Amino acid sequence: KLKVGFIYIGPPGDFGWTYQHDQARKELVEALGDKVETTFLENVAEGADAERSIKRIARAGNKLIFTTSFGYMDPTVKVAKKFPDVKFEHATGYKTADNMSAYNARFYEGRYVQGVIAAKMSKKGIAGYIGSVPVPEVVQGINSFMLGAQSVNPDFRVKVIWVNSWFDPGKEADAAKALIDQGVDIITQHTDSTAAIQVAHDRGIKAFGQASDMIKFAPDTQLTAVVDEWGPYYIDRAKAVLDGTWKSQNIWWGMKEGLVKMAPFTNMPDDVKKLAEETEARIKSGELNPFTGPIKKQDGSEWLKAGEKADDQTLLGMNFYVAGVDDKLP
Ligand SMILES: Nc1ncnc2[nH]cnc12
Ligand SMILES: [Mg+2]
Known part of the structure; x- marks a missing residue:
């Protein structure tokens, strides 16, 4: 064998x-x-x-x-x-x-869909984002999520807390509690565990699963998940x-x-599910690429011109945020 x-x-x-x-x-x-x-x-x-x-x-x-x-x-x-x-x-x-x-x-493709959903669902227009380590994969995900949200609510905000590792259920839980205590009404993460989604579920705060469909840990509050x-x-x-x-x-x-695939779309109105489906479908066909201009950076400079698609090499070294993100990159 x-x-x-x-x-x-x-x-x-x-x-x-x-x-x-x-x-x-x-x-x-x-x-x-x-x-x-x-x-x-x-x-x-x-x-x-x-x-x-x-x-x-x-x-x-x-x-x-x-x-x-x-x-x-x-x-x-x-x-x-x-x-x-x-x-x-x-x-x-x-x-x-x-x-x-x-x-x-391309996990960031799922992030875009979640951002769209988040902007339709969040009444405050604020999501809590639990970061692992600030490598380009994670920066891509934050940026894509924001761009997705901004295609619905231009004023959408995220609050980022860094855990500084991929898997640390204690710190993941602490981060979720701190973000919910600070008033966010959506939780999402780039860490590995179900710790944050159970905290969110415990507080009745809607959230996205990560890597796996985490519905069983948040049956009435998971919206969907980016499934690997x-x-x-x-x-x-x-x-x-x-x-x-x-x-x-x-x-x-x-x-x-x-x-990469989305988990089922749950715990949201039918029109939000229809839009999530449509968005995933457009990415899956090749019509939608989250990183397509016009897009500006956090410091105000232009990144991508109207209709201009990012080069993959830029994504793979991504070390800047798009406009609208408030975090300082480590
Ligand atoms: N999301 C992740 N969790 C753990 N290790 C990773 N390596 C790359 N992405 C990762
Ligand atoms: Mg494509």
């Missing part, structure tokens, strides 16, 4: 980011169980822990290894050099090697290893390609 390994930055118990990775591992086992065997390690920190943990999985005989967090980028590039018969698949990074692929999702569909990708790459056709590739895919 092909031994396939997984490194997670959190626990499957997060019921968000790591959980979606592990549910996709389970999809792999269900589709190719007779020919594949999976192993994982969880709560693996960036840096030395990641290097040792990736090396250990390779030394145990795993011939395809998925490193499922951005901070594993450099550790995966380093370790891959020492294991030429192993194939490595790094999540959300932009670095590849002869035996290392990079798989990224890793399973078909994991199956395809395992098949490619099994049949000997696996080759290094760098990909960045979104709704059109099926890597």
Whole structure:
């Protein structure tokens, strides 16, 4: 059997980011169980822990290894050099090697839809945003969310609190409570766990799930969620290893390609659901790209001209906010 390994930055118990990775591992086992065997390690920190943990999985005989967090980028590039018969698949990074692929999702496409919904739902026009770490993926998401909201309410605001890691349920909960205490009427996040959405549900504040459909933790208050569909990708790459056709590739895919999808649209009026559907549909067809001008930056300078679509290279290094965001970027 092909031994396939997984490194997670959190626990499957997060019921968000790591959980979606592990549910996709389970999809792999269900589709190719007779020919594949999976192993994982969880709560693996960036840096030395990641290097040792990736090396250990390779030394145990795993011939395809998925490193499922951005901070594993450099550790995966380093370790891959020492294991030429192993194939490595790094999540959300932009670095590849002869035996290392990079798989990224346009999560910001889902953020745009959520922003549209948020601007229709929030009576105050204010959302609480729980940031993880200020890497370009997160800045993209904040910016896209705001642009979506601003296509309904030009005056929409977000209040951002940084947790400073991907998974930290204590700080995620604290951030949600602080944002709700400060008067926001929508909660959203780029951290990994269900901590904030349960706080929001406990306070009757409507929210978006992250990575996974988190409806079970907020049945009457989740509006939708940006859902990461890793399973078909994991199956395809395992098949490619099994049949000997696996080759290094760098990909960045979104709704059109099926890597990102919205959860069902719940707890909102029918016209808001119709508009969410229409928005997702326009992104999925290629008609709507959230980062299409006119768009100005936080400091007032123009970014994109009327009708001008962003280059992906700009997004991948994104380190500025669009006009309307109040946060100072770390
Ligand atoms: N949303 C996320 N959670 C954890 N690790 C990540 N790496 C990239 N995006 C991530
Ligand atoms: Mg497009």
